[PDB]
């Protein structure tokens, strides 16, 4: 079965990058307005050290994963003024110059798609990179891919027309380059129509990015119920017990409140450390595709989408990244009578990269990538032994192109 | 989270740094896109962080850049493999020289396992 | 060093040493103080062991990452873009290190480059000649063919290109006469 028709499709991959940050104090959470609650906590001072150093380790880990996915090169690439690519419309991935933000029309559609606590000590650490620095790193990769392809991520920036960048992608899988020039207008219409199908689908919530915010908000709401918990006492507020009893007798109730809150703190911090392994594993997975699918052409089967990968177009996303791959999946195919080898004058002719086919009347030779009927020549095959050793072999006369060139 | 060389920044309120109209690389991370440094004598100043040099080759359908010179470089990668090992006893750490501390620990014997 | 401070911690008692309490009080009344010391130390043990297990995932993830480059960058040539250094990887030289490993890759990064007038295809006698692995360039006077890897000016021959259709289907195509190396070999 030799493929006779191809279809260009776009694969969208959603992989999270990092999450939010939250710093919790050791003393403020346990005691709000008391003096004797600042005395019994000194005995458990070694527990706050293991918690303060753990919260700082998460803030430096989520910020480090951002510098490994969106920060790959050290050069800023601007958009060229010439918008000529042979027919491929790239106005949807480039940022709008009229709007003050550095985000394109696709980035704003995905940003709006994914839709009081500091009084107790639940503060939020401000991030490093803002919304303008994340969109700038994504715009530099889109401008460098259409002008260089793969030299901007491994060395100096080299200019190259877009008509030649597409031909260099099919040569890595076996497809010839003459098919692109003979059907350049056909792919230009299928590529623009594929963007409209994805645009209409993403405009009508991302489950891979919404669950990240839900798990972070669920952990903050869990500590709210811990504040009103008595942990086997008569009141959760430590000011109500001291206002009705004496210190020497109420010391057994404050100890149960401090010990009960430490169980929730050791569970909340451990829960964030266990979930940090899933974020770190997803960060290295997203950073791998950034340097392989986007930068250059990855030869890994089923890694940069579904099918033969060509190029990629990374986009920005709140607490995540959006991947846009260009796969190559054939469409229609035809069946032909295949021939393993051809015996001529006692010599078995073996092909180099193609295979002999037959339509019922003649015998042609073509590759296993696209239908390209040619003629039987001597420069495309080679002899190897006789015809008595090959199991399956047919018989066909060689045209011999060099013999006429002599008459 | 305190609202306010007085400088009203977006991430907080830094008192002790003069704001300049220039932009350089990031030296000390602060937050919300704030990078502090110690430059010009020299004092602690605050400015807006940069993103690198802005340059791009103009697109042309009749030009190509062919490399004419190469340079061999050596890249050093440092990746850890393993760490140290430490064994902690269940009874010795909890009790050093006592008899009744070897009786109450039997009730919590499932934790040592 | 964290477990050192745990030894002197009272955990809400009067003394961290369990021998000082029994030396001044009676067993039937001091049993409520020993239980608080044992329970307080179990919290540090369940935290120290859990901390080592969580950090073990980062060491295991770094071990499989270092073992991957050992069998790909060092052993053979890995075709993965940006994995065995920065640029085109050739070979590697692993070294030893205390509690770690040192990798020494040999990258291939170009230096200077020149610009030339590129040609997509060449029309001769009504046939469009397409290259196999190179691209036609021009220095302003002649038309040479070379690959996109290194500057190697050659001549226009028939064994390096192939015909595919006419010259009315290609969008961009120039005009240049083929030298035809096989025709002289006959005179």
Swiss-Prot record, chain B:
Positions glycosylated per UniProt: 3, 21, 40, 61, 69
Cellular localization per UniProt: Virion membrane; Host endoplasmic reticulum-Golgi intermediate compartment membrane; Host cell membrane
S-S bonds: 4-13, 26-35, 90-112, 95-101
Impact upon substituting residue 1 to G: Increase of pseudotyped VSV particle production ex vivo. Increase of viral load in hamster upper respiratory tract
Protein family (similarity comment): Belongs to the betacoronaviruses spike protein family.
Other remarks on this protein: Variant D614G has become the most prevalent circulating sequence in the global pandemic since April 2020. The mutation is associated with higher viral loads produced in cell culture and animal models. It would not change pathogenicity nor neutralization properties vs vaccination. May be prevalent because the mutation increases virus transmission in human population.
Annotated domain remarks: Contains sequence and structural motifs very similar to those of a bacterial superantigen and can directly bind and activate T-cell receptors. Activation of a broad T-cell repertoire may be involved in the hyperinflammatory syndrome in acute COVID disease. The KxHxx motif seems to function as an ER retrieval and binds COPI in vitro.
Protein name: Spike glycoprotein
Lineage: Viruses, Riboviria, Orthornavirae, Pisuviricota, Pisoniviricetes
Gene expressing this chain: S
Full-protein interval shown: 614 to 761 of 1273
Swiss-Prot record, chain C:
Disulphide bridges: 73-84, 123-167
Residues modified by glycosylation: 115, 139, 175
Effect of residue 159 to H: In strain: Alpha/B.1.1.7
Coiled coil: 1-34
Domain of life (superkingdom): Viruses
Function per UniProt: Subunit of the fusion protein that is processed upon entry into the host cell. Mediates fusion of the virion and cellular membranes by functioning as a class I viral fusion protein. Contains a viral fusion peptide that is unmasked after S2 cleavage. This cleavage can occur at the cell membrane by host TMPRSS2 or during endocytosis by host CSTL. In either case, this triggers an extensive and irreversible conformational change that leads to fusion of the viral envelope with the cellular cytoplasmic membrane, releasing viral genomic RNA into the host cell cytoplasm.
Protein's recorded name: Spike protein S2'
Species classification: Viruses, Riboviria, Orthornavirae, Pisuviricota, Pisoniviricetes
């Amino acid at each position: 079965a030799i493929p006779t028709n191809f279809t260009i499709s776009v694969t969208t991959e959603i992989l999270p990058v990092s999450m939010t940050k939250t710093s919790v104090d050791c003393t403020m959470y346990i005691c709000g307005d008391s003096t004797e609650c600042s005395n019994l906590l000194l005995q458990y001072g070694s527990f706050c050290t293991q918690l303060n150093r753990a919260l700082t380790g998460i803030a430096v880990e989520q910020d480090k994963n951002t510098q490994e996915v969106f920060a790959q090169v050290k050069q800023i690439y601007k958009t060229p003024p010439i918008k000529d690519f042979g027919g491929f419309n790239f106005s949807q991935i480039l940022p709008d110059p009229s709007k003050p933000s550095k985000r394109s029309f696709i980035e704003d559609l995905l940003f709006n798609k994914v839709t009081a606590q500091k009084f107790n000590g639940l503060t939020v650490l401000p991030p490093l990179l803002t919304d303008e620095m994340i969109a700038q790193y994504t715009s530099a990769l889109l401008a460098g891919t259409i002008t260089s392809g793969w030299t901007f991520g491994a060395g100096a920036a080299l200019q190259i027309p877009f008509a030649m960048q597409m031909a260099y992608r099919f040569n890595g899988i076996g497809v010839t380059q003459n098919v692109l020039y003979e059907n350049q207008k056909l792919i230009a219409n299928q590529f623009n129509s594929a963007i409209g199908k994805i645009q209409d689908s993403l405009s009508s919530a991302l489950g891979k990015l919404q669950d990240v915010v839900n798990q972070n908000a669920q952990a903050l709401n869990t500590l709210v119920k811990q504040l009103s918990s008595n942990f086997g006492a008569i009141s959760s507020v430590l000011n109500d017990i001291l206002s009705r009893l004496d210190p020497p007798e109420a010391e057994v109730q404050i100890d149960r409140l401090i010990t009960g809150r430490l169980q929730s703190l050791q569970t909340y911090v451990t829960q964030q450390l266990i979930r940090a392994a899933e974020i770190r594993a997803s960060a290295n997975l997203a950073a791998t595709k950034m340097s392989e699918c986007v930068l250059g052409q990855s030869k890994r089967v089923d890694f940069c989408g579904k099918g033969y990968h060509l190029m990629s177009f990374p986009q920005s996303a709140p607490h995540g990244v959006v991947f846009l791959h260009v796969t190559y999946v054939p469409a229609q195919e035809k069946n032909f009578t295949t021939a393993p080898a051809i015996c001529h004058d006692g010599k078995a002719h073996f092909p180099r990269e193609g295979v002999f086919v037959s339509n019922g009347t003649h015998w042609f030779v073509t590759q296993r990538n696209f239908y390209e009927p040619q003629i039987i020549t001597t420069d495309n095959t080679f002899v190897s032994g006789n015809c008595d050793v090959v199991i399956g072999i047919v018989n066909n006369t060689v045209y011999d192109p060099l013999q006429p060139e002599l008459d | 989270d305190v609202n306010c060389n007085v400088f009203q920044t977006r991430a907080g309120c830094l008192i002790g740094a003069e704001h300049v109209n220039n932009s350089y690389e990031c030296d000390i991370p602060i937050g919300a896109g704030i990078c502090a440094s110690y430059q010009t004598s020299q004092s602690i100043i605050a400015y807006t962080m940069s993103l690198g040099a802005e340059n791009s080759v103009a697109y042309s359908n009749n030009s190509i850049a062919i490399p004419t010179n190469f340079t061999i470089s050596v890249t050093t990668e440092i990746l850890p493999v393993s760490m140290t090992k430490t064994s902690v006893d269940c009874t010795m750490y909890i009790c050093g020289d006592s008899t009744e501390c070897s009786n109450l620990l039997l009730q919590y014997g499932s934790f040592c396992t």
